[model samples]
Target: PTDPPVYPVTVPFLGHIVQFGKNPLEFMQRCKRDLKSGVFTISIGGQRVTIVGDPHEHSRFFSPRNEILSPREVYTIMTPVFGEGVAYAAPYPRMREQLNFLAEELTIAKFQNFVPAIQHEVRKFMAENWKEDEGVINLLEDCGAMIINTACQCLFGEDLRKRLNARHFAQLLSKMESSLIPAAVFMPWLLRLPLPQSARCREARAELQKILGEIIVAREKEETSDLLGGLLKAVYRDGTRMSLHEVCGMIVAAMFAGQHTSTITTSWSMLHLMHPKNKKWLDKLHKEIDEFPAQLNYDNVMDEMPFAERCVRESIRRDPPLLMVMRMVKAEVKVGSYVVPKGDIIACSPLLSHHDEEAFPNPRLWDPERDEKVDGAFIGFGAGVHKCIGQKFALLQVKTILATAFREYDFQLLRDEVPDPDYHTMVVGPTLNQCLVKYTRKK
Candidate 1:
């Protein structure tokens, strides 16, 4: 008789649910500790999930198939938040089409057109927060506000930014984040029972829809150079225009993907830059930025700042905002001798893969130089056709913010302590209370 195939035993009852709920990173760490490298079955919200950590196995799990993996099946939890017709929930072809539109409209050329908008927002933020007298400012919040303002200006134009308050946008994003989690959807009864966050989610969606509706209507009356207009101009091969709802959905999705991750990653990058070991790289980055044309247009700035790009990539690797990339297996896929059964959730963390000892020596150390050396290993913006479309835009945004700050002010972390990852939502960011040192103009 053939020997029985060994599969990691499923923990019954509580399962890995509690561990996953508290901190997913820790949960994965625990899985590595207990199970080593193997397939482990575990219950999550009444579903049996197979977890695999072997890099080769993960690659096999991620192999492309004619029947594409469904993000919605794995992330069914996100349906309420993303809503119906959201690309992540749509079929593969439709999702690809939607992603293509987003990529084209938010490209380097289109993003270049919005450089003034980004500069305007960054300068305004710096002016408001940086006083002549030395003081402390919450860098995380400041960065968030700056990014949100820039996103609003770039995506909708300045008029809409004035009409809709930043706090409102922040609140909407927060509510959506809260509502999108598996905990919220897994227990419908709990959510239906006057949950404050559930109610907040409904209100936020309504407000956002109303605001977007007004912007769409206004833009329809007169064309503008904003992303919304660019998206409107995009047409399929058959010349079919995107419906108003589709446009609105795309706008909201883009805003979420672009603003939240950029804000977190930029703030984290600044934090890493403040560390003593990493401080020398800042000078090098400044020199690189300075070499760009005095006019400092987006194209010239990006072309000239390879070190800055490396820093961004390293920061993203060290503290990825979206830690895990998830997809559902469409069919039984061979992963080594083992086959990942259909309907299994497949994922790998940049946090884990990027930190592999063989891949990155002294992985915990903050080293931009190392990042530049190991270019392809960095999965910060992800890889393949599904790589972030707005990656160039994001890089330019972070560099622009840092360059403006470096030119205008000298700064430091207000507290010597590093901020803990803000894991309140699925997307990680800096703890709310951490501040940064504020300084006046040098003599």
Candidate 2:
């Protein structure tokens, strides 16, 4: 089998970083179109970034177990952020166990009280901040605040929240994230240097662990059912409970990863539903959620709001928060007519695949009613063995926020068009400056 064609490198040292950095969709599309193939390889800082852009070939990338295409090497840079010997840094079997513990915590069984919890937080946020009859606010900023606050409410007990409020938790996450050098993923040697950011990240993680330890000691006197308690009750196959460090790392991973992506997804869903062009979809959303009571229940948000879920899904299809999901090829795998050799980094991009003309006609237009022409084409939550475990919880959170926010307020985008996708950040979202919108209390 032959290798995929390589996009010619204009700058040998920097590779395609400049082009991809400026606009990822345009750059990848140009490469795919010019190469005349759905699968093509491009260089990023001397590393081969082979993108699997074909809708039909998505199974080829995602179906393989981690042994064949391991995610650990590609995610090695996360070691410091997740702490040593935690999650991705752990061995495959141990990693699977750790992730399962997290998944169990977010299961539907645990979601019985989540809807009402989420609704309470959303309403409280609006009453406290968006109190005016009609006033302008940054929807992105507001949604971000709501996501963190609601997540903390659902995941932490009242005593825990009192000890560590959402605002302080956000600062801790920021300190840990600021220490990430994304470039170190491609050039892992950079991580070996004694960078100050690494030390700061260690300090942040340590502080979080100390707080968690204190909370656990106090909670020993009383039983609780929040996420932290669920995780604490988890035991490995060896009948050993998680260490304080492991529990702390899991908490950080859960919050740090979900915080930005969920916030961005909620922001995009609101932005689309508010824009004049998509008023029909917005009306459809109202049709679905209008009858629900002020205090929403699990079934109300989970089973009843199919249209609201579609709005959330289509928003993700158009502009996924996490653009690319990647892995290191541990063994050769056939994708189409080409063989992806061992030692290559294979990436399946949601942004590129979701925009394929055949898979999604008029891909730029937001349409909640439309389905993918190609089956399994939508990988917004990914697919197969390593799919995002937090997807259902994340979607539930966004959908509830949508139902609650729209029930009380009517929003108007100040601009005539939807905000441009800001491609600069690791988790892409609508441009910050363009997110200003006016809110009017619904009569």
Candidate 3:
């Protein structure tokens, strides 16, 4: 019946930008508590941001059709990175088709050979990097290296990999990622002005497009199965095949989406599992994966290793990579006791929702066996229509790496406790410098 309470503003122009940016969870929780409401509004560069912090009201934020709660305008910042007129920048129906095409490529049917491919890359990375009987490593850095290497192995064909090796592809992705200013999502006018980063991203995408064009020409003469092949065959509702530009855009989006977030997820899971206090859970994970053969297959990763899956989920629950899932409120919608008006930037915070005391009960404690006290309380991968399509593939990748890495090495954290969540970046993860660990080859 009424709008959510606004957090009182001390600075008119700056609003809560600094406070929110400094520590999003604390700021959001303060807003939720001080206003005496789970739903509250804050200002960022004068943009109205209404956060759905209540666990019970998550569906209200996520279930609305795009007409009522659209994501297009809010995600305009990604247009250049994903390419113009691609993904969220495309029309809603077209966007759905595009994402469906991607989802199809990552589905269970395409996964038969992926397990071994991922496992092979992981082992190769270990043999190269963890060469000593015992050595120290920056777990975050190493995990990131493994994630990009393994994702390329599974998604790209042999000829494509030769043309675009993982290291080169990673550089391209880093260029595109560096160009992204996440705050542009909240400040639309910033995109109106020119940015040097935009040009860099464009050049990066063009380089990728050129490589893909040559690869496609060769593949036309002789075919093979891989993500690129799958995407090339995708047909839209209008019965038109995807253009090279569109296909390249989809590939960039898929890799860019998974690269950083999956790396952080894998890093956090490993950090938590290797902590001395969490030995019981680590033992359970070993038990679940120990029975599998030296080589893992699709079924072994997908159907087996439920405990390993839980550890990964629990890690994400503790610190979700992408903090907020946002939409532009096109029409007024009811969100529990509050009615959010049109034009508001409405968001559901996984950081806030996952820590709700009633739902998580000692939320900071990592427990794989823990279930949400409230139905749909956990929005780590989001919920409803906009839920992450890449989650299954990502989880499969991380869980397999866990099974592979821990099987060969016994890890010990140099720090007294798990590294604190680093909220400085757009995609949250553990503090980088604090992630040092010692690894010993299991004999």
Candidate 4:
């Protein structure tokens, strides 16, 4: 005698598609509430996905394994658009090396040079818009400009930053965003029918490749104090240099990953700080900034502002830049009584993990103080080896910018209302084009 095979508990065919598609966060909550500790399947964009939300089961998938559960195979849908060696296409060794370089060299010391660039850009923006009274400005768009400019200056150099426009880089970034979604690559036939968005994506990739190629050629003639130069000089243990295509792919991927999420998170932090109740934290953050020397650079300022770090951490916990982290099981894996099969995509929503009542009390409320305690299980930057490599740099960037803004300006949100995030793409952002704030010099 044998027991029945346990498949998904949802309806056959559609499974959990309707509810999951409507609101992924709520769907995961419902699943956790109902199933507790079992494997369940759900349909996402017509594909069956096995979800493991239980912490013990989730750890089994993420922990050290020799199995074929590689993210590269799971995210194969990105290959064509992000290029063969870009995004998740790079081999394990190469990915580790590149990420290490970014964390060690680019993120740590490189940020010191970025403060001047950020200040220059911020001042320029303030001076230009200071006179506008009772007007709306998209906080996300402005933050995008600031992050792009800062990244370009640090990664490519000021000369190139002056030459490029927002539209050009936005086009490149937009293509990368589109490439991440399953529809673009999984169903190429649907995208090939002369759709406007698809066509723009194609054109954008071409233009970006051209620009990067020209920049590489220019770099060959003179040395630069930027990440591109360091990347060009990097080599494996075998003394092999990155190819021209590899260089371009790496930069494009870095820009897309590093810039967009930081911008969105920073915008949300600033918006939250504008609230009257939250204004107390802003004052505390300013006090932290004052402890550092008046002329402190980005690195120095970041080291001194623990309060700002906590605030950013809380902001990310409340509104994570990425809602979920998806992976695939490459072999039969047993979790309690259920066995997840090979080639089954496994997803764990951070929205659920960070907001669990056991992990966070009154999770809906915005409280940075809660994060200071170890009882709260907040993993905004992910965990283990695959955790975000650029997280330190992002924190430095966000804290420095916010510290500078608070120290130099007195500001308030234009309206009492805050915008809900638009989730139409890989990265989430506020629905209103801008986060409007009125500000003046703090003399």
lDDT per residue (tens digit) for residues 1-443 in model 3: 99999999999887899999999989998888899899999999899999999999999998999999999998887888888889988899999999999888888877888889899999999999999999999999999999999999999989999999999999999888888778888886665777653457888889999999999899788745788888888889899998888899999988998987999999989888998889998889888988889998888889898888989999899899988999999999999878999989999999999989999999999999999999999899998878888999999999989999999999999989998888989888999999999999999
Clashing pairs in 2: none
Each candidate structure's TM-score, on Cα atoms with residue i matched to residue i, is 0.87, 0.97, 0.97, 0.86
Candidate rank order under TM-score? 3, 2, 1, 4
Q: Candidate 2: where are CA atoms >4 Å away? A: 190-199
The 0-to-1 C-alpha lDDT of every candidate, in the order given, reads 0.67, 0.90, 0.90, 0.65
Give residue 32's error in model 1 in angstroms.
3.3
Q: For residues 1-443, write the lDDT of model 4, one tens digit per residue.
A: 21113235456545554675556667676766765643466655445566655544556556645344567766676565567775468877776676666555456667766766666666566567654433456677777777776666556665556556655676677766664545432223444455444434556666766776788777677745576666677786768887656666666667777676899888888888777878787778777787665455765656667778888888888778787666666776665567666766665566667667666667767787775233324556666667787787677667767876676677777777655666555666666554776665665
RMSD of each: 3.4, 1.5, 1.4, 3.5
- Residue pairs in clash, model 4: 138-433, 138-434, 138-435, 139-434, 139-435
lDDT of 1 by residue, 1-443 (tens): 11113234366544556767677666665565575544444556554465554443445544465375556566555555556776677776777887798788777767665667778778887777775656677777788888888877777766667667666777787787665544433333444555443245666766777776788787678746676677676676656886555666677777778776898878887877765666698788778766554345766556767787788777787677876676676776565556666666666566656655556777767788884234455566766656788887788888777777666666677777657776666677777677565555544
lDDT value, residue 351 of candidate 1: 61
Better of 3 and 4 by TM-score: 3
